């Protein structure tokens, strides 16, 4: 019937918006990802600089000697 079909087109509308979800959300997932991978490269930097402070300290002490 007619009113049934009107609001059934409404349900079709809700289906198409969820199709929009299906098209958008995972792209959001793998755009969050690489930000984090760069942050892991940043972990690598942090480890490097851990190594670096001690070197600086021993260098300055031997400079004093």
């Amino acid at each position: 019937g007619q009113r049934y079909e009107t609001i059934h087109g409404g349900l079709d509308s809700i289906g198409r918006v969820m199709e929009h979800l299906k098209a958008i959300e995972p792209l959001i997932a793998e755009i969050r990802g690489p930000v984090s991978q760069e942050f892991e490269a940043r972990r690598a930097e942090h480890a490097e600089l851990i190594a670096v402070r001690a070197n600086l300290d021993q260098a300055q002490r031997q400079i004093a000697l």
Partner: nanobody
Amino acid sequence: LRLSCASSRSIDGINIMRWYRQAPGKQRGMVAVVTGWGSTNYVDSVKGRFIISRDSAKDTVYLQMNNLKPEDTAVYSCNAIYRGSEYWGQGTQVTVS
């Protein structure tokens, strides 16, 4: 049928580096390996197929496509490892046939 990358600095002061293949709709995959030694190996799929070579001078590494069957069609990205870190570039793609 021949592809390369350049590092920021310190080629051969850069230890192990390798290349990776990204077939579409699939996840990451290693391709071939050069070392600081020039010691080299490939993955079984591309064994015999691809050839890799290092130029010590101009801060670079080389991959040359060979006798390719379209199945290898993918987007490739060249990788390197430095004092325990990842190093990834932007990569580039290869096509059918």
